[PDB]
Amino acid sequence: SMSFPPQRYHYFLVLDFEATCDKPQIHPQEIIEFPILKLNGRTMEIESTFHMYVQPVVHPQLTPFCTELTGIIQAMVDGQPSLQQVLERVDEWMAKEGLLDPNVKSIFVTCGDWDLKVMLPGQCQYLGLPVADYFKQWINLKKAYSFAMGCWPKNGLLDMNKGLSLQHIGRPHSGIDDCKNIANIMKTLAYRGFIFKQTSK
Ligand SMILES: Nc1ncnc2c1ncn2[C@@H]1O[C@H](COP(=O)(O)O)[C@@H](O)[C@H]1O
Ligand SMILES: [Sm+3]
Ligand SMILES: [Sm+3]
């Protein structure tokens, strides 16, 4: 096939939350890291980065497990805006990037469905906040990978990097680093000729 074919979107918006957690799981979970990488729709190159840590409210003190898992320390979320304000910052960032133009086509890309099917809508429902329409469609990279490679990856980014012989970027369970791996996997899948499609229902 053709390497780096024409794609259906002008930009891809790579997103990977980190959230409060514990062993056994904390309830409710709350977003504590909100990264978005804006990728050129054709080349998959990173052109802009949104990144904010978020101050949790229901369980404001990060557990030892959460800090061990994510590397996020208490001082990184203390003094930060809450999710409501971060969502307003995202909307302003989308506007300045030119992504609110109806003729500019973009879609979010996540590893799995959890981030936009479960985490964001669930916390927004808890807080009584509407979900912006652009969060309601996305590409699940694991499903896209399964069509591009003909196989179901077992453990997310690590196994997709393994299958494509890519070196892992940065630290697992860091939101921004997970985004960098998603973007690197996407670049390789496009190099192999894959055309990305919405997977969310
Ligand atoms: N092994 C785990 N045990 C408990 N919670 C987890 C685990 N892995 C991920 N999580 C939660 O899911 C969020 C997203 O995970 P990830 O995108 O894989 O870093 C984390 O920030 C945690 O809140
Ligand atoms: Sm993740
Ligand atoms: Sm992650």
Swiss-Prot record:
Active-site residues, as the UniProt record annotates them: E18 (proton acceptor), H173 (proton acceptor)
Q: How is the cofactor bound?
A: Binds 2 magnesium ions per subunit.
Origin, by domain of life?
Eukaryota
Which positions are annotated as binding Mg(2+) 2?
Answer: D16, D115
Provide the binding site for Mg(2+) 1: D16, E18, D178
**Keyword Magnesium attached:** yes
What name does UniProt use for this protein?
ERI1 exoribonuclease 3
| Full-protein residues shown | 137 to 335 of 337
